[PDB]
Symmetry: D2
Subunit: 118 residues, 4 copies
């Protein structure tokens, strides 16, 4: 069973802590990233999909950055590799805030992140 609750770290060096996942699949947590003024914490809220009670469920969460006007959403699946290790393969969209609707076209970045247990 791949569980989201716990401590994770990714390929960029960012860390994330997720608490208990309730009966509805909802969970909260903290997302930690460094600036290079050193470390900043931002809350995250998301849900794990519980349809068919898969052992490798899909999920999604939003990171509400506390040091910028931007928002990032992550979606992915909690996998169990060949070694028996849990791994989160995710993709994200990073939304920047623009002051005019005419600039909307360049406000969204996309990328990936792989998380492993810390």
């Amino acid at each position: 069973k791949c569980s989201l609750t716990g401590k994770w770290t990714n390929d960029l060096g960012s860390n994330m802590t997720i608490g208990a996942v309730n009966s509805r699949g909802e969970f909260t947590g903290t997302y930690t990233t460094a600036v290079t003024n050193e470390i900043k914490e931002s809350p995250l809220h998301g849900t794990e999909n519980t349809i068919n009670k898969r052992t490798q469920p899909t999920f999604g969460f939003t990171v509400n950055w506390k040091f910028s006007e931007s928002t990032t959403v992550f979606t992915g699946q909690c996998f169990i590799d060949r070694n028996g290790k849990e791994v989160l393969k995710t993709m994200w969209l990073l939304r920047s805030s623009v002051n005019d609707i005419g600039d909307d076209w360049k406000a969204t970045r996309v990328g990936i992140n792989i998380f492993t247990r810390l």
Copy 2:
């Protein structure tokens, strides 16, 4: 004035969305309604609105926990006041499908956009 997320919205695909009040922490919940040819499904959503600098056109993100499949979709965008004075949500999303092998991961994510206006 300010663009507010709370309310009823409909998008360019015909899906409807209801968002509740946004608390002090910027959190909100709602419902997402889509069709399937009418036979309609209803799924819950949870997200947050960025409160930094209390901008009048904030960015936000939410997750839709589909109740009819094992998939998950996340949306992010900004609440704009268009040139004609109408409120409009410009969003982009990622649709994550469930795969059985970590080896099939590469083909599990679709991307697209959705524009929402008040219902």
Copy 3:
């Protein structure tokens, strides 16, 4: 038959001209966009998929920006709407140039563009 050859314009106001598509599905053209110093032209190269000689083929092309170090790639399908009009529904990735591999994560933007005959 939805054909790529011709003049197109999109939702942002940019214009594009594509020449003849050869037997291998390859085509070239010009991509015009304004700055708001007014108009700039950049060449594009791409290919249309010819498998099963579909009347609504998929395609892809790269725009080699002549005023920046960035590159944009578009992929989409040439459709025929209910009115009988040709429409190109596309999605693109805009790659910015970063000076260090450590900044690679924030170098890619994503978006859409719908083109109609000009």
Copy 4:
């Protein structure tokens, strides 16, 4: 020195790619080889490398014209000189599937990444 596109590459998924010489206009052609469980397919690719400011780590883009399906994939990225001195192509791609109705357009595009190193 400079990161050059010309040569043989292999990615994290196991696919191989051969890129030819890049002319003065920054144009190039090549071949993309992927497996299907070995039974391997071969498809042509055409793209360009950005020549502005003759950077040593240029951005580029190319299209792969799949010969076994009606799909098309485009890649874009940058040719980097990693910290250990190795040349590496960091890329992102969009995979466009063919749909029969403009109404199914929304679900026709997948997105992902690929990292290429010299073979």
